[PDB]
């Protein structure tokens, strides 16, 4: 709420970092390397962002990313399609979302209906090379399915602020070259903290 | 031109990385650490961004960062205040800009008049803790001055896509904990490349 904009801003940051591989490029530089061809990027303008959860944080993510020329589509079981239209998000059924997205970001609570929302089945419905963000709750994205998608190239990269266990005991995801991550920094701004 | 958006998008990524230290957090995580207090961030909303150079790239930066609630001010000796007003940037004299800015980004050519535009003299006029981006041309920001400002804390962080020498022979800046960097990735998208 107070921290809605902090979360939204981190999520936008992560989307940009996935598009241009800034964290990996920084590490490359700090290891004394100059690897231009290796970190060839993607432009956000004209790409489709899928937003799962169209509450406050999801809406703020949407309007920011609209300024980059992203097409914003999304899903929410409560919010009406005419309401979401009013902040620029085209609502569709979940099955329609997967195959259109170049980027997917999650903004839901952790519920039975949202645990493993992204899983082996839904990654198989995505465009090859999809990039995924989770700055919401650990477990919305099934961690084993994500790892398998990254290993096959079905998923070209992921950004994670949250994990099923924190700090994460399993290291496979964190350690993957196409994964960027933070130690649950979503609310961690001076402004969010000091009301 | 074709690559204007690619550059503007990298710039905005770098601003978000400075605000939340995403590259440093990723490196922390990959080294098996979980360092939440270390990577306490700043919210962009309400902060002032100074844009030096209000051509196509600077303007695209401005409208993206306006969506985050940044106040956008800037300087350009050639663009008229009425043109810049049309994309939401308050033009001011250079001497007025420095003290106001939480973030400064440069979007000029490399000319005698822009070489060391940010130097010991102009860092001294900045707000303590200013964060600086250069995704334009190596040398606009004086590299020794930038290093001195980082070491004193006058500058809280810097994002560099470009360097006076490429790759940079001097390593002090790259190696600093508060410097994020890329090997000149501004135009390196599939879209900029493949017209
Ligand atoms: C299955 O997807 C969902 C389930 C629940 C919510 N939101 C709340 C507050 O319950 C959002 C989504 Cl997208
Ligand atoms: C004194 O600073 C400048 C000098 C020149 C330019 N731009 C061009 C196109 O010449 C911009 C600045 Cl900010």
Numbering used by the authors:
A (entry chain A), B (entry chain B): 100 to 294
Manuscript text:
PHGDH-93 was then successfully crystallised with an empty, accessible cofactor-binding pocket. Soaking of all 15 fragments into PHGDH-93 crystals was performed overnight at RT using a fragment concentration of 80 mM in 20 % DMSO. All of the fragments for which crystallographic data were obtained bound to the adenine-pocket suggesting this pocket to be a preferential site for fragment binding. Analysis of the fragments’ binding modes showed that four of the fragments (5, 14, 15 and 16) were coordinated by hydrogen and/or halogen bonds, whereas the other three fragments (3, 9 and 10) appeared to be stabilised only by apolar contacts. Of the four compounds forming specific interactions with the protein, fragments 5 (3-chloro-4-fluorobenzamide), 14 (5-fluoro-2-methylbenzoic acid) and 15 (N-(3-chloro-4-methoxyphenyl)acetamide) constitute substituted benzene rings. The most potent compound according to the ITC data, fragment 5, bound more deeply in the adenine binding pocket compared to the other two structurally similar fragments, and formed an halogen bond with the backbone carbonyl of Gly151 through its chloro atom and a hydrogen bond with the side-chain of Ser211. Fragment 15 formed a similar halogen bond interaction with Gly151 through a chloro-substituent. Fragment 14 was substantially less potent (Kd = 26 ± 31 mM) compared to the two structurally similar fragments 5 and 15 (5, Kd = 1.6 ± 0.2 mM and 15, Kd = 2.8 ± 1.6 mM).
